[PDB]
Design an enzyme around this catalytic site. Structure first.
Site, PDB file in Angstrom:
ATOM      1  CG  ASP A  63      -1.892   1.059   0.997  1.00  0.00           C
ATOM      2  OD1 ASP A  63      -2.909   0.873   0.427  1.00  0.00           O
ATOM      3  OD2 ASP A  63      -1.996   1.939   1.935  1.00  0.00           O
TER       4      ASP A  63
ATOM      5  CB  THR B  49      -2.670   5.043  -1.937  1.00  0.00           C
ATOM      6  OG1 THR B  49      -3.966   4.559  -1.369  1.00  0.00           O
ATOM      7  CG2 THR B  49      -2.056   6.155  -1.223  1.00  0.00           C
ATOM      8  CB  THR B  50       0.648   3.400  -5.806  1.00  0.00           C
ATOM      9  OG1 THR B  50       0.669   2.577  -4.685  1.00  0.00           O
ATOM     10  CG2 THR B  50       2.107   3.495  -6.191  1.00  0.00           C
TER      11      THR B  50
ATOM     12  CG  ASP C 290      -6.169  -0.965  -0.106  1.00  0.00           C
ATOM     13  OD1 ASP C 290      -6.610  -0.264   0.673  1.00  0.00           O
ATOM     14  OD2 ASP C 290      -5.185  -0.676  -0.942  1.00  0.00           O
TER      15      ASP C 290
HETATM   16  N1  LIG Z   1      -5.979  -7.803 -13.556  1.00  0.00           N
HETATM   17  C1  LIG Z   1      -5.223  -6.444 -13.947  1.00  0.00           C
HETATM   18  N2  LIG Z   1      -4.718  -6.451 -15.206  1.00  0.00           N
HETATM   19  C2  LIG Z   1      -4.239  -5.319 -15.422  1.00  0.00           C
HETATM   20  N3  LIG Z   1      -4.232  -4.031 -14.844  1.00  0.00           N
HETATM   21  C3  LIG Z   1      -4.541  -4.331 -13.661  1.00  0.00           C
HETATM   22  C4  LIG Z   1      -5.079  -5.198 -13.060  1.00  0.00           C
HETATM   23  N4  LIG Z   1      -5.570  -5.086 -11.956  1.00  0.00           N
HETATM   24  C5  LIG Z   1      -5.120  -3.725 -11.497  1.00  0.00           C
HETATM   25  N5  LIG Z   1      -4.612  -3.188 -12.556  1.00  0.00           N
HETATM   26  C6  LIG Z   1      -4.121  -1.901 -12.862  1.00  0.00           C
HETATM   27  O1  LIG Z   1      -3.046  -1.584 -11.782  1.00  0.00           O
HETATM   28  C7  LIG Z   1      -2.991  -0.431 -11.566  1.00  0.00           C
HETATM   29  C8  LIG Z   1      -2.206  -0.305 -10.056  1.00  0.00           C
HETATM   30  O2  LIG Z   1      -2.939  -0.752  -8.871  1.00  0.00           O
HETATM   31  P1  LIG Z   1      -2.384  -0.806  -7.736  1.00  0.00           P
HETATM   32  O3  LIG Z   1      -1.229   0.069  -7.396  1.00  0.00           O
HETATM   33  O4  LIG Z   1      -2.358  -2.100  -7.036  1.00  0.00           O
HETATM   34  O5  LIG Z   1      -3.784  -0.042  -6.809  1.00  0.00           O
HETATM   35  P2  LIG Z   1      -3.165   1.218  -5.881  1.00  0.00           P
HETATM   36  O6  LIG Z   1      -2.902   2.465  -6.794  1.00  0.00           O
HETATM   37  O7  LIG Z   1      -4.247   1.628  -5.008  1.00  0.00           O
HETATM   38  O8  LIG Z   1      -1.751   0.781  -4.979  1.00  0.00           O
HETATM   39  C9  LIG Z   1      -4.395   0.206 -11.182  1.00  0.00           C
HETATM   40  O9  LIG Z   1      -4.476   1.675 -11.800  1.00  0.00           O
HETATM   41  C10 LIG Z   1      -5.168  -1.000 -12.253  1.00  0.00           C
HETATM   42  O10 LIG Z   1      -5.932  -0.200 -13.143  1.00  0.00           O
HETATM   43 MG   LIG Z   2      -5.024  -0.191  -5.795  1.00  0.00          MG
END
Ligand SMILES: Nc1ncnc2c1ncn2[C@@H]1O[C@H](COP(=O)(O)OP(=O)(O)O)[C@@H](O)[C@H]1O
Ligand SMILES: [Mg+2]
Ligand SMILES: Nc1ncnc2c1ncn2[C@@H]1O[C@H](COP(=O)(O)OP(=O)(O)O)[C@@H](O)[C@H]1O
Ligand SMILES: Nc1ncnc2c1ncn2[C@@H]1O[C@H](COP(=O)(O)OP(=O)(O)O)[C@@H](O)[C@H]1O
Ligand SMILES: [Mg+2]
Ligand SMILES: [Mg+2]
Lengths: 532, 528, 535, 139, 52
Positions: free
Chosen positions: A54, A87-88, A391
């Site tokens: 996170d 958040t990232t 989350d």
């Molecule tokens: N199964 C998937 N295939 C492709 N892209 C994905 C998948 N799951 C999530 N993502 C993308 O990865 C990006 C990063 O998500 P993540 O960094 O884990 O969430 P956060 O930004 O809250 O930490 C998100 O913008 C999402 O659109």
């Molecule tokens: Mg996320």
């Protein structure tokens, strides 16, 4: 000349320094993005270890002394509080916006023009997202919630186990639904108690159809299982009665001392008997219970729990229909406890979870509650599982509240970049450049996603841009708006078909917050740092 | 990681690899380029560097500034090295090379951050640089007439363009004329040691003069020197390498006599040896005697008695220039002082220049050397004047070698950028992005010119791009009018080899910097 | 803004480019220019109180505690212990003015300070410093042309030294020797005119010996058409005065000859010893007799000699002096018209110099004796013997006389003069202002600032004299405009008239042109600097 | 502690091989700045902290001439080229180097352009190291 | 002004005279306004916020 007791930086120096600080913060968390992202391990110089993905947690644990980096850290915290996801992404987007804006400024573009262009681009991006890139969840059903939860739990320690964890999250969220005035179905997340206990694998995590207390019965003589529970929730300690500060006992005739001392405990005995006479089986109190009242409860075969947390007690009372009673005093001036003030449940047990015990209030009546017991391999794993689960719960809450979702996997950023690059040509002369740079900065998310997978980022992003350009140019190829990134194969894919969804509020709020942060930092052109 | 009881490398070794170290290298190159960013153009400003000893060096030369900067970053040293290379091979454009290399690296940094393989970037740079050099050679303007007037005008214009960025730019026409005259009268090898540069404190810049001969400072005259006449109307100059003073005949010589008459004979023999050398010099008909070795007081008085002029301990370079101007030969022995080995000048004179006495040899008709005498108000003033004149002299020499000129002011680079963009628009697309980045990077020089002049760089760049697109090869930045103009018609001329070498060196530096993936730094030895 | 750049990279790993970069400093952009202008203004404002007849001296103390009370600008700045680089540039500018001209070393600093002060307010309005430098160059060209236009020519004949005397008096007016003003100017003019090549050629300052000795009075300073030597007759019983002396200049010590090469003379018998002794005695007698044969009345040697030669010289009525320095030997040979003879065998009558009087001079209760050679026939060398009441005024008189000699030398080079007292600066400012009106507006500001900077010299003269600067300068400028008279200046001495031509305040045109040129070039060089990288 | 040299070659214990005549005047005491032996072994030049150069005769043992005129104490002094009447330089703390001549007992020449501590005559004698180089023939 | 040789009391009184004249000039340049006009109030507020 100035004679200010401190250091001063002015012009390109301070701007480049701020950009460097923001870029460093972005680079800290850039490696934990997307399904092929990897977690980090933080050591807290006393041996404490935190393993997390996170962004908000990573930025809070880190100690930072550059104020622009602090601005980005608080940006991540705000995004966490108001949304819970992305958040990232918000941090990365803000840093890239700052980089490109500073490049524009170094090209002698006045920062006011860059700020105006960024504001226009953010407004147009939000409008375009709301007008073209949203999908209603009415025609999808529970599958939409499941897919949103699974997408949220990707890039987390529970990502592979989504088929099970998404069902758990959706059931927990739907189990706490309540409708307020105006007929608006609101979902009070954070009412789902999350309990962590190492032991069996993640598959053995349990979804309680009730409430779980991190407490045990106060006395070994009490039973540890009651079938038809009549929960009595109290907010006052059950101890020997002691007079207040303003009351003092002065004895002149010794014959009254024994009566005084006896009444000191007979008061609490009478209170216990009044509570028990209504058929109560389970007694929960936020205060303490001494041994005397514990024995009173033991003789009656009733479970008594002390030092119950106030929030847990409130949730139990709301779910079971019980009422918190800070005191036993009716409107007639008497001291009484009536049976109408009692909650009910179908079973209350004290189960054993890996050499420890906790109380389960199973199947409460008059309202359905939920709790989750997370089983992991050690404490760090359970903590990260809890963060990821939170989350997912927040994502499901956002999806259920606002019924619009947007395709994931970089589709929204690519579509926005194409649209803004086209749209900038119809606005201003230098805000044109600012909007173009906003569009270019929006592409950092798919680039990072592709890079984290060790894929050909340039060609993959180029193919994504070509697909979205064709979608926005050909009126009959509008179905290509959903083409995102499939990181497993490193190829573009219809993410709406693949079920990679996420709430619209995440993108909207992240864009707004990142634009605010970039505007705030970009406004600075001089720094005075007084010596402490 | 782990302690690894026996560690592999020596303790204290610093290692850095991957994308982050490449990005850091690019940033360091940017830092180096920023140090000379504002020195470029007619509106460029000088930089002052103070060493540990306290001496201050004031310069506009990019190579000098980079050398005075004590750079220790391994990647940043490449830009200093290419600046030195440009100075050595060409003599001008030492700021352009650094700006171009840094701009190349900056332009390709976003692609490096995305994980693009460095070999692709290197190949793209090589292809773009080859195309740009070919284009420069193709469109460079040369005149195949060998006209003396046209050649002189071309050299003067090139010198003025090379001079219109230094503190002597107000007298750029004057100094360009001087430099062209000096280089033209240099004979066949254009040796820099055949152009004397004398700095004398005091006096205006316009007081500086070019001697059609040789001039050097007075060299520690002995007693009786003030009785020698200080002007001659057709002297014959004896260039000697001889110690004309009483001394031991040889280091290991040892005289053994046992009679007083032999003692007196030995004394008179030493005196007669000295007087025989002096008589041999005098009977040659020479009137000016110059020696690389000390000339004693006895010889000074002997020459004063004959209305002769003597000057011992002349520096060797000054004797070489005197030989090449007057046309004699340096003699280590005086036994054969024939008319062949005697120099000749129209007028010799000693005159005062700002609290110093100088010896002048003028009127040499077949002189193959010069002597710049530079006036100014401070040591650093004369030093920077000499540096600027050196830049102009190197440009004029290169233009003498080949008269292939390209209009300056960023016109050549805007044309190259347009050509490279046109080429890149017709290739698959992985190399298209990198060649386009190269073409965009080629815009740093006109942008830096506008930024230094206080203009709005974006508007000038847009106007230049439109003008080059619609036709007109030689349109560049007009600093005075804050607009664009046909810089070829404005006589903003540059030898083509300057830009050719600049592009070559910048491309090589960028390729070398990009090719490095890991930096290993061994611990210091004998820190003391 | 200071110390340079400091990032330590965006990845946290070290980012070090320049050695000891954390210990170095860096000033960039406009604030560097402002700091330089402030330092130069400080130096110029320190110096400007010592400008004009009412200027005040500065008491300079070096690292050893020695005191130098002086008014010369170049000397003051040379002895000033500065660390700022722009201050060093000011010092070098003064040294340049001293070397090229010899006078006006204080005016250049004040002019440069005024120019930079005006350039400060020009920069505050958003004008590029290169534009300011170009405007200053244009205005300097205009001012130099105007000086050439309004210049006046004087006669440099030896039969009429009045204009030369007036110029030397104007140069000396600001110095402490203004008490002996006319005598000082007279001796400086006579010294320069005596040793000079008349075809407008150079003046060899090596032929002017400036010698100082404490005691006496400053009025006792005199020009001697000969050489004053810091030596005396070798034998105490030699006569102290020789008249119509036939002088023999020698560079051979009065000792038995010695070969330069490593030599050993072997004595192998008693007869060899006797022969060696006789050879010694005969060489002494022979060298003395050879000196005597030429008819010489006085002998000067450079390398000293021993007892036998001393007594032989005394016995033959041959006064002699030993250990005379090389430059003094050259001066004596030049003045007396005698050649320098390297050995006795080459000494003939025709190589003898002539001096009308050679005397030994005492200096009160001090035991010090100094030789005087004078009354030469056509002496081409002079000596200025300076007396005083303390060493400090002696040094100040030395440098003041040097200034006067340099001014007369400049007049020898070029005989065009411009009347001082600030008249030249005021007329140049008027010409610059008139030429600025026709100029396009952008360079007009630089030219107007140049005129205002030129106005500083009359204002400094006015405030040093106690008068109100602005009112006096304005009235003088108005008078200059009203009636065509570029000679109206500041009445520093309160003589009752503003016309410097009747007041005979005369300055060499070369000096003013050099002042303006050097000040403009240094100001341009300082304006072009925009970065400082001290450790 | 501070000395660690009290047992120095002072003993000079030998088999009486004609070298025992070391003289060792040391009458003036004070500080023997320079005890240089003249090329002609007849005379000894000594400089003291008072700033006066002293010339002694080894045979008679009497102070020939005390050379005074130095501004400060004479840290170093040298000898003539070979003998040449022992025209010796004297470098001291007063930044000045000057030459003396016993045939007259006067400072024949002086130089001040630099404390001098490493005087050394040129083999020819026309100059001397001034650790610079001063020329006798040109002062 | 001081470098020109003017006492720092003539400067003060002259500055007071200039201030009085400038107050007169500014008052002459001014325009009446009544609070009933919302447009002027909005323009003033926007002008105040233009620099933030
Ligand atoms: N199964 C998937 N295939 C492709 N892209 C994905 C998948 N799951 C999530 N993502 C993308 O990865 C990006 C990063 O998500 P993540 O960094 O884990 O969430 P956060 O930004 O809250 O930490 C998100 O913008 C999402 O659109
Ligand atoms: Mg996320
Ligand atoms: N009169 C001029 N007008 C416009 N540009 C000029 C002029 N003279 C020189 N330049 C530009 O200055 C650049 C080089 O700057 P300069 O400092 O003179 O040399 P260097 O490259 O060695 O720093 C050249 O690219 C040239 O185009
Ligand atoms: N009698 C005088 N009346 C008016 N002005 C004078 C007089 N004598 C000298 N001045 C002026 O005083 C200025 C300063 O001269 P001075 O201090 O002697 O040398 P410097 O020019 O080096 O300061 C000169 O510019 C000269 O014009
Ligand atoms: Mg150049
Ligand atoms: Mg003067």
């Amino acid at each position: 000349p100035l004679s200010v007791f401190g250091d001063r930086s002015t012009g390109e120096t301070i701007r480049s320094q701020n950009v460097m600080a923001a870029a460093s913060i972005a680079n800290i968390v850039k490696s934990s993005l997307g399904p092929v992202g990897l977690d980090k391990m933080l050591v807290d110089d006393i041996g404490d270890v935190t393993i997390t993905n996170d962004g908000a947690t990573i930025l809070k644990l880190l100690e930072v002394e550059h104020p622009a980096a602090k601005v980005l850290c608080e940006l991540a915290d705000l995004q966490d509080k108001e949304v819970g996801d992305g958040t990232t992404s918000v941090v990365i987007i803000a840093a890239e916006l700052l980089k490109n804006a500073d490049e524009l400024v170094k090209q002698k573009i006045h920062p006011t023009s860059v700020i105006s262009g960024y504001r226009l681009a953010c407004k147009e991006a939000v409008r375009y997202i709301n007008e073209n890139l949203i999908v209603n969840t009415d025609e999808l059903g529970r599958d939409c919630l499941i897919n949103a939860a699974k997408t949220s739990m990707s890039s987390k320690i529970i990502g592979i186990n989504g088929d099970f964890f998404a069902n758990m999250v959706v059931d927990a969220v739907l189990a706490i639904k309540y409708t307020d005035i105006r007929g608006q179905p609101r979902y009070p997340v954070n009412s789902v108690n999350i309990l962590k206990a190492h032991g069996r694998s993640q598959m053995e995590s349990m979804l309680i159809s009730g409430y779980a207390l991190n407490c045990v019965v106060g006395s070994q003589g009490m039973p540890k299982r009651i079938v038809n529970a009549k929960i009595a929730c109290l907010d006052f300690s059950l101890q020997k009665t002691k007079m207040k500060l303003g009351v003092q006992v002065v004895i002149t005739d010794p014959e009254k001392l024994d009566q005084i001392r006896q009444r000191e405990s007979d008061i609490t005995k009478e209170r216990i008997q009044k509570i028990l006479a209504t058929g109560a089986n389970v007694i929960l109190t936020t205060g303490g219970i001494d041994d005397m009242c514990l024995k009173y409860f033991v003789e009656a075969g009733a479970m008594a729990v002390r030092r119950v947390l106030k929030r847990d007690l409130k949730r139990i009372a709301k779910a079971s229909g019980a009422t918190i009673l800070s005191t036993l005093a009716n409107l007639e001036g008497e001291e009484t406890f009536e049976a109408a003030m009692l909650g009910q449940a179908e079973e209350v047990v004290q189960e054993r979870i890996c050499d420890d015990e906790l109380i389960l209030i199973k199947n409460t009546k008059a309202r359905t509650s939920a709790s989750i017991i997370l089983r992991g391999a050690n404490d760090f794993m359970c903590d990260e599982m809890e963060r990821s689960l939170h989350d997912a719960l927040c994502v499901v809450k956002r999806v259920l509240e606002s019924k619009s979702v947007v395709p994931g996997g970089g589709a929204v950023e690519a579509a926005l970049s194409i649209y803004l690059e086209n749209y900038a040509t119809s606005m201003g002369s230098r805000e044109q450049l600012a909007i173009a740079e906003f569009a270019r900065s929006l592409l950092v998310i798919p680039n990072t996603l592709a890079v984290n997978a060790a894929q050909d980022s340039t060609d993959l992003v180029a193919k994504l841009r070509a697909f979205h350009n064709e979608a926005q140019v050909n009126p009959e190829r509008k179905n290509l708006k959903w083409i995102g990134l499939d990181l497993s194969n490193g190829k573009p894919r219809d993410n709406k078909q693949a079920g990679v969804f996420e709430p619209t509020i995440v993108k909207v709020k992240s864009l707004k917050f990142a634009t605010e942060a970039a505007i705030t930092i970009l406004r600075i052109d001089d720094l005075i740092k007084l010596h402490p | 990681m782990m302690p690894t009881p026996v560690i592999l490398l020596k303790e204290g070794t610093d290692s850095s690899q991957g994308i982050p170290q490449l990005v850091s290298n690019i940033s360091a190159c940017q830092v180096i380029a920023e140090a000379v960013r504002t020195t470029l153009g007619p509106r460029g400003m000088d930089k002052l560097i103070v060493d540990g000893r306290g001496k201050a060096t004031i310069s506009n030369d990019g190579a000098t500034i980079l050398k005075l900067l004590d750079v220790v970053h391994p990647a940043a040293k490449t830009l200093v090295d290419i600046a030195k290379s440009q100075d050595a091979e060409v003599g001008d454009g030492t700021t352009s090379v650094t700006l171009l290399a840094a701009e190349f690296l900056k332009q390709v940094k976003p692609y490096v951050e995305e994980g693009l393989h460095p070999q692709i970037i290197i190949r793209a740079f090589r292809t773009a640089t080859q195309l740009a050099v070919n284009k420069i050679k193709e469109i460079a303007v040369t005149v195949k007439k060998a006209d003396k007037v046209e050649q002189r005008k071309l050299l003067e214009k090139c010198a003025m363009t090379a001079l219109s960025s230094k503190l002597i730019s107000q007298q750029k026409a004057f100094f360009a004329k001087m430099v062209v005259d000096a280089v033209m009268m240099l004979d066949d090898l254009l040796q820099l040691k055949m152009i004397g540069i004398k700095k004398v404190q005091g006096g205006a810049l316009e007081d500086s003069q070019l001697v059609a001969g040789v001039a050097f400072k007075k060299t520690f005259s002995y007693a009786g020197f003030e009785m020698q006449p200080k002007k001659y109307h057709n002297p014959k100059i004896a260039l000697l390498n001889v110690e004309l003073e009483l001394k031991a005949e040889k280091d290991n010589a040892e005289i053994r006599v046992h009679t007083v008459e032999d003692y007196q004979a030995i004394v008179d023999a030493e005196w007669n040896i000295l007087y025989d050398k002096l008589e041999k010099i005098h009977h040659s008909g020479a009137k000016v005697v110059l020696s690389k070795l000390p000339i004693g007081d006895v010889a000074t008085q002997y020459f004063a008695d004959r209305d002769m002029f003597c000057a011992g301990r002349v520096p060797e370079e000054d004797l070489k220039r005197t030989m090449m101007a007057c046309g004699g030969s340096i003699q280590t022995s005086v036994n054969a002082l024939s008319a062949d080995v005697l120099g000749r000048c129209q007028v010799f004179e000693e005159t005062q220049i700002g609290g110093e006495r100088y010896n002048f040899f003028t009127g040499c008709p077949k002189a193959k050397t010069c002597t710049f005498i530079l006036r100014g108000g401070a040591e650093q003033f004369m030093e920077e004047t000499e540096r600027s004149l050196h830049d102009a002299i190197m440009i004029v020499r290169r233009a003498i070698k080949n008269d292939s000129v390209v209009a300056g002011g960023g016109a050549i680079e805007m044309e190259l950028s347009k050509y490279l963009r046109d080429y890149s628009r017709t290739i698959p697309g992985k190399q298209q992005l990198l060649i386009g980045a190269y073409a965009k990077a080629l815009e740093i020089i006109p942008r830096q010119l506008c930024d230094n002049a206080g203009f709005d760089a974006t508007n000038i760049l847009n106007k230049l791009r439109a003008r080059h697109a619609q036709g007109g090869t030689w349109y560049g930045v007009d600093i005075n009018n804050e607009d664009i103009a046909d810089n070829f018609e404005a006589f903003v001329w540059e030898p083509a080899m300057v830009r050719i070498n600049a592009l070559t060196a910048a491309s090589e530096a960028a390729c070398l910097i990009v090719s490095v993936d890991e930096t290993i730094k061994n611990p210091r030895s004998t820190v003391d | 803004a200071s110390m340079g750049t400091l990032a330590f990279d965006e990845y946290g790993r070290p980012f070090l480019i320049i050695k000891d970069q954390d210990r170095k400093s860096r000033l960039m952009g406009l604030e560097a220019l402002k700091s330089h202008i402030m330092a130069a203004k400080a130096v110029a404002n320190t110096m400007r109180t010592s400008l004009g007849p009412n200027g005040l001296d500065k008491m300079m103390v070096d690292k050893d505690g020695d005191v130098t009370v002086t008014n010369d600008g170049a000397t003051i700045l040379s002895m000033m212990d500065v660390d700022h680089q722009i201050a060093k540039l000011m010092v070098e500018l003064s040294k340049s003015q001293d070397d090229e001209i010899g006078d006006g070393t204080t005016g250049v600093v004040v002019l440069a300070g005024a120019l930079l002060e005006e350039a400060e307010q020009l920069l505050d309005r958003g004008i590029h410093p290169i534009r300011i430098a170009d405007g200053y160059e244009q205005a300097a060209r205009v001012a130099i042309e105007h000086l050439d236009k309004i210049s006046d020519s004087v006669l440099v004949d030896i039969k009429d030294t009045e204009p030369l005397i007036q110029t030397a008096k104007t140069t000396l007016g600001s110095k402490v020797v203004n008490s002996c003003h006319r005598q000082m100017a007279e001796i400086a003019v006579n010294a320069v005119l005596t040793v000079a090549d008349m075809e407008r050629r150079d003046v060899d300052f090596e032929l002017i010996k400036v010698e100082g000795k404490v005691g006496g009075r400053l009025e006792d300073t005199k020009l001697i058409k000969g050489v004053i030597v810091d030596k005396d007759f070798s034998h105490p019983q030699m006569p102290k005065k020789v008249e119509d002396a036939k002088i023999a200049i020698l560079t051979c010590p009065f000792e038995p000859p010695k070969p330069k090469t490593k030599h050993k003379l072997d004595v192998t018998s008693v007869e060899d010893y006797k022969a060696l002794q006789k050879y010694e005695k005969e060489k002494f007698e022979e060298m003395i007799q050879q000196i005597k044969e030429t008819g010489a009345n006085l002998a000067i040697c450079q390398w000293g000699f021993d007892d036998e030669a001393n007594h032989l010289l005394l016995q033959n009525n041959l006064p002699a002096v030993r250990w005379v320095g090389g430059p003094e030997i050259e001066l004596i040979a030049i003045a007396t018209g005698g050649r320098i003879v390297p050995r006795f065998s080459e000494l003939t009558a025709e190589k003898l110099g002539f001096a009308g009087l050679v005397q030994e001079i005492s200096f009160g209760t001090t035991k010090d004796k100094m030789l005087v050679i004078e009354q030469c026939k056509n002496s081409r060398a002079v000596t200025i013997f300076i007396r005083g009441g303390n060493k400090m005024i002696i040094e100040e008189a030395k440098r003041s006389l040097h200034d006067a000699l340099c001014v007369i030398r400049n007049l020898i080079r070029d005989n065009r003069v411009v009347y001082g007292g600030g008249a030249a600066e005021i007329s140049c400012a008027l010409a610059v202002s008139q030429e600025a009106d026709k100029c396009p507006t952008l360079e007009q500001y630089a030219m107007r600032a140049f005129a205002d900077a030129l106005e500083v010299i009359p204002m400094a003269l006015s405030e040093n004299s106690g008068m109100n600067p602005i009112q006096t300068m304005t009235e003088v400028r108005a008078r200059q405009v009203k009636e065509m008279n570029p000679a109206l200046g500041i009445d520093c001495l309160h003589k009752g008239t503003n016309d410097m031509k009747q007041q005979h305040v005369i300055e060499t045109l070369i000096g003013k042109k050099q002042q303006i040129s050097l000040a403009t070039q240094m100001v341009r060089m300082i304006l072009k600097i925009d970065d400082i990288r001290k450790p | 502690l501070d000395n660690k040299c009290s047992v120095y070659p002072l003993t000079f214990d030998k088999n009486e091989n004609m070298a025992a005549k070391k003289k060792s005047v040391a009458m003036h005491t004070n500080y023997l700045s320079a005890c240089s032996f003249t090329n002609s072994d007849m005379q000894i030049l000594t400089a003291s902290g008072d700033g006066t150069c002293a010339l002694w005769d080894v045979e008679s043992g009497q102070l020939l001439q005390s050379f005074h005129g130095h501004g400060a104490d004479v840290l170093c002094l040298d000898l003539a080229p070979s003998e040449t009447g022992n025209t010796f330089v004297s470098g001291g703390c007063d930044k000045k180097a000057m030459v003396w001549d016993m045939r007259s007992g006067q400072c024949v020449q002086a130089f001040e352009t630099h404390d001098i501590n490493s005087v050394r005559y040129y083999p020819s004698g026309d100059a001397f190291a001034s650790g610079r180089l001063y020329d006798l023939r040109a002062d | 002004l001081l470098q020109k040789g003017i006492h720092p009391t003539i400067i003060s009184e002259s500055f007071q005279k200039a201030l009085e004249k400038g107050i007169e000039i500014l008052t002459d340049m001014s325009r009446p306004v009544e609070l009933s006009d919302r447009e002027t109030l909005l323009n003033s507020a926007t002008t105040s916020l233009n620099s933030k």
